[PDB]
Amino acid sequence: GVITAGFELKPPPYPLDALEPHMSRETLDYHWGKHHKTYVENLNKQILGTDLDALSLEEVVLLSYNKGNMLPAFNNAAQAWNHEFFWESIQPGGGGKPTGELLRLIERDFGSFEEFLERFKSAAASNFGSGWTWLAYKANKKLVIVKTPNAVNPLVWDYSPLLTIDTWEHAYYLDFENRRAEYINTFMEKLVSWETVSTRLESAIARAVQREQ
Amino acid sequence: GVITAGFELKPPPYPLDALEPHMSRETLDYHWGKHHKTYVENLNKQILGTDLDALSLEEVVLLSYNKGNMLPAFNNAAQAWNHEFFWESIQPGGGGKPTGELLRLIERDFGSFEEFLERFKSAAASNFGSGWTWLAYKANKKLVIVKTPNAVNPLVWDYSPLLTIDTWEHAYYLDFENRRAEYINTFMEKLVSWETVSTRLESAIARAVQREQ
Ligand SMILES: [Zn+2]
Ligand SMILES: [Zn+2]
């Protein structure tokens, strides 16, 4: 019947030069304007002739993971989802420390925020090749750091992601060249949006509680 | 006893601007001068305190693969070997078609050079994330196209690599941005050193011939 426009390219929740000098306008132009755009476009092309665009992007990822023997649309669907989650994981004037429930959970499960911080930055740095590092909440220790290769994300294992850093080379060449550790550091000191991470934790907690009831 | 310098960063067998305009001086400066350099430096740091530098790069790669559960030196040792193999896979004024025994083996195992060409370029483009695509000889069809992720190469499986293309994003951002397919096209059309590939196939056959004794 009436066609859809498929999945959309959501812009980052801030102007493309808002993350300077930590993430440049050229990076967002290239990372969002080309790579993220291309994942969405390529996904829309792959699902032409099907009703998959009726589903949420989440649902497409879950459906094409196929317990690890991934189906053709997975990489583009996962990358589309991962990149939207990425832009919303950061903000102008990010960095600093979390507060409230999120801080308490981090310190219950990692001892302290500083310990969590070093373990997250170190996982981000040691994930070889292309991929992502996540903080994630699991209901069924509630907080875990996750390393995934390429397009994979923890939704595929029923974890609720809370934070991610893109460590595909395209994510930091223009600002840090090959110095990923610097990239990872600036990310935690200047860009991470702890308010967004807390919002996502409150939602993961609600979903878990509500599953019981 | 007396110490070694560890593994050396061998320069590409041509001036750093000799691949222009297909692969820029900037690309070589970044890809050889930083990424390849960093692999060798990080490998040498990892094997301080051991006698692995008495071994060939090949031997370290095989030793650290551990039937898939790779040991700590693998990524740097495999990348170091891969990048050396890469720079010598190409040449100023490369491209064109292979001749002699190599062309005839390709046409036997792929039906034609154009078919081999299409399957190779298609494999290189469909290898998601970071990795490599290879033409390889197996003694046990004698030629095979192989996709590997991240640092893996076909030595690990007792194949003799004959040709490779680096499809890590750092291999082609500076010349093709995200346009990997165009990079692959220019590679097979302008850079591949079929003469070198033929030389490698000679040795591979000799190694298999001598293996009969
Ligand atoms: Zn990305
Ligand atoms: Zn490389």
Numbering used by the authors:
A (entry chain A), B (entry chain B): 1 to 140, 157 to 229
Sentences from the paper on this structure:
In Angiosperms, the plastid-encoded RNA polymerase (PEP) is a multimeric enzyme, essential for the proper expression of the plastid genome during chloroplast biogenesis. The PEP complex is composed of a prokaryotic-type core of four plastid-encoded subunits and 12 nuclear-encoded PEP-associated proteins (PAPs). PAP7 belongs to methyltransferases, PAP10 is a thioredoxin (TrxZ) while PAP4 (FSD3) and PAP9 (FSD2) are both iron superoxide dismutases (FeSOD). SODs are cellular defenses against superoxide by catalyzing the dismutation of superoxide into hydrogen peroxide according to the overall reaction: 2O2– + 2H+ → H2O2 + O2.
Five molecules of PAP9 are in the asymmetric unit. Four of them form two dimers. The fifth interacts with a molecule from another asymmetric unit to form also a dimer. The buried area calculated using PISA in the dimer interface is 1785 Å2. PAP9 is folded in two domains similar to those observed in FeSODs or MnSODs. The N-terminal domain extends from Gly1 to Gly93 and contains three α-helices. The C-terminal domain (Gly94–Gln229) displays an α/β fold with a three anti-parallel β-strands sandwiched by four α-helices and the N-terminal domain. No electron density is observed for residues from Arg141 to Glu155 and for the last 29 residues from Gly231 to Asp259 suggesting flexibility. The catalytic center is at the interface of the N- and C-terminal domains. The zinc ion is penta-coordinated by the His31, His83 side chains of the N-terminal domain, the Asp182, and His186 side chains from the α/β fold domain, and a water molecule supposed to mimic the position of the hydroxide ion.
